[PDB]
Amino acid sequence: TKKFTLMEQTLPVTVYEMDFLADLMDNSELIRNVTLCGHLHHGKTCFVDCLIEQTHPEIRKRYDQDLCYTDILFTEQERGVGIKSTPVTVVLPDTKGKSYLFNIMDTPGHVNFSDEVTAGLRISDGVVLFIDAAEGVMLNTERLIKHAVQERLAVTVCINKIDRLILELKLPPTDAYYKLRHIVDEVNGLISMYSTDENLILSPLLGNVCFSSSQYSICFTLGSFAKIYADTFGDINYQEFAKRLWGDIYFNPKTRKFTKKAPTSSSQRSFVEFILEPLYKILAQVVGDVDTSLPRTLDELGIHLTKEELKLNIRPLLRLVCKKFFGEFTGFVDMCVQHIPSPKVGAKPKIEHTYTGGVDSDLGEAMSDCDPDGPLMCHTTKMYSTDDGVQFHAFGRVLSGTIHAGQPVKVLGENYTLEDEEDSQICTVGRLWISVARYHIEVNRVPAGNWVLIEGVDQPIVKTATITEPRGNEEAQIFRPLKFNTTSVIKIAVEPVNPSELPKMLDGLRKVNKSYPSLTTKVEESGEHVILGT
């Protein structure tokens, strides 16, 4: 046996109903999806480990091992990234009080793996970036910013390991606000420096960036800090608070008097005092001040722990303290829905720049497909291996229609066209699969507007192939494939040692090429099989 990884066969989560969450994501428009990458190997999975850790009741303790589910890719993910990106979805509440359905797919940091991460990013209508506070923006952030700018997809700046980079380097608050302000100046400078409109408006007050730390797993933002500080005292200030939260201002003795210009002797900036002051002091309350100041700061912050829990160790008490203070997810969903567009509003330009034929009967078929239902048109994403290596499930985007179990669908190929489709063939959907953390939910019929996995399409599915209704629906089926934004360089020709292994090498090359659409398997004129990758 010894299957590589188990993506299914897990228990349910806490405060999550399959009825309410499934029909809620497949019914209203509050559902959305995105993928957060940014810099390569900047602790992207750690975010999904924090969200899934706050969702499911059983989560791996950070002290024992990584919070991610065990037996995932084995040394592939254990060494770094590995998975060319896998989809996941969960229901995350928001700071406004209303929950939401968010599908987040972690992305690898490797070059070609980032190209496949963009190929998978062509499905969702939005993307977030993971930028470590230490290294700032990496090459994967620049290339991902160029590919995301060319894709016209909304991106959300997300800072990772903020308290880890500032705590390990012992950065002062002035160099923390100035350094982070320089990183945001480079993010907005590259976004506005890319092309088209400057309306992105990347900034902490605009809610485009979220300051988080993977060491203590503390996710915060402007509205999150204003909601926590206002929740403690002065809850009447919410919008006017976060708007005046940082900016350039000082806190003047008049009670609140915020100085826009001049030092006014108060502080170098308002975000340093009112933001970095309770932040860095919370991290400083541990370590040397951990045992000493625990009753004073813990009693002042209202947090409490058991005698054995508080005496556990430095880092477990730090992640547990951040869980007892900033552990509530606020800026992620609040800053998400405020950034990520709705399904229709983000779908219309996406369907305009995605499918070939637009306008009537095609974009109109997709426009009418958005809210109520589609006329059975499935524009996928990709296909990954199942729990067994025999078959492979197709994890893809559904543009229109409610996929029914066993219902036929017309799936075209790459070179196939709407006028004449040679590769178009009907197929039945065995079972629907929704990927949530380490498990998956099988459904018979999944309505339109959700990216899910299905079975029954293996051989006719090659790379990215959209499915259409068996009725012969016209007007631009088989949506255009995603561009990897890279050129094939490395060519590795593999030949079987035994001559009888030729069919195993051909079939293994077909299934391997379908498992990694980024690579290109081309048979040489001399008869050898050569591979091409970035």
């Binding site: 040394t75 390990e168 012992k170 403690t232 200030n237 609140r256 004073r296 700061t297």
Partner: protein, 445 residues
Amino acid sequence: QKEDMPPEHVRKIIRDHGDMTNRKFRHDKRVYLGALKYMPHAVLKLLENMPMPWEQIRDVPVLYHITGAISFVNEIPWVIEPVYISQWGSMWIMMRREKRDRRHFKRMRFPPFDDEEPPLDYADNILDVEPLEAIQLELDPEEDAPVLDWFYDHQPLRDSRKYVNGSTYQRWQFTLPMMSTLYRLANQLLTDLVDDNYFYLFDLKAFFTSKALNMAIPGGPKFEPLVRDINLQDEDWNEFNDINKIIIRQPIRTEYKIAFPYLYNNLPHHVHLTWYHTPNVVFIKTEDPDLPAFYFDPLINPISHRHSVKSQEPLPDDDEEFELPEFVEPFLKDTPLYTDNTANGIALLWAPRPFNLRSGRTRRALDIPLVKNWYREHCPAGQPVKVRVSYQKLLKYYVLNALKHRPPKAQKKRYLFRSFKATKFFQSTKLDWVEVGLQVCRQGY
């Protein structure tokens, strides 16, 4: 319940009448045949009794046979903490200071046998007077004083707030200054820096990868041909796979094929490899105990704003009227800079496994209180040939024990050595390494 008998009565009486033989031990003959018939009692007892040079003390309770045949000493290793590892390593630092001094060395050696007639009863004089030797560590700037009181002990903390609070060993606990002075005295001995990629691509999964691919490294252990027998090749297969005229750039770097299992296609069977890069983090080194909390590393911010951009809504009315500070605007009043060794604790945030563990649980001081192997991993050229190959031999034993793994299967029961006291067998008592060890020597004779 088993109670401790008088040591001089059972010890002196048993061992006194035991070796006399004649008609007193005539019935004890077979009992002595059982004593000599049991090897592991004296081996595990003597090896289990290790007062160590780091302290000066006596040994522990032991069960001496009611017939005077032999005894056994059951003592758990009871490894204390990295402060204890810093007590042994501190004895190594002070031992190095004594090595630099004393221009005229000592003799030592001298196995005082001279054939054999030391049937020494002088243990009574060992009870009379005491050497009061070893120890000799006075170093502390009013810091390690609690660890100085815990420097030499069989049970470092008898009873306290943070402690094991057991008979011998239990879950460890300590305070912040114990970690401070622990990293101080431990920092005086051999200490490891941050891991990052320096600790990788060398041993553990890397060594298992080198042994799997059966290829040498820039120095290190060596294993075997493994699955490969002698030679397997073909004239048509070599001409198809390779080429007489091909591209030549680099001379096939072995390190490139090591970390890349796709680069070397020869015998990719049962290989644990492909650990990609590292986190590539940066740990700020310590400095003199001065202020401020920021070490002022090179930064040079890009001219701060320099006419870049600003926020929105710069209206003073909505600003001063946007908040009502009815409570304290900051979290709490404090000085989170130098307060309570915030620099020493901040440096303690990144610490090795023994130091970063804070309060410990248990460890074996008779098995692995040695960090020297990892310190010897990837040794520079500062050592001679024989020392380099010897380091490759130490890494060869560590790589053998590492690659051996373990089948942690089930076991029957423990305590069976101590469970032999259920019926009448022996009687324990508090004894010393000279008294109990000398009794084991008489049990050998």
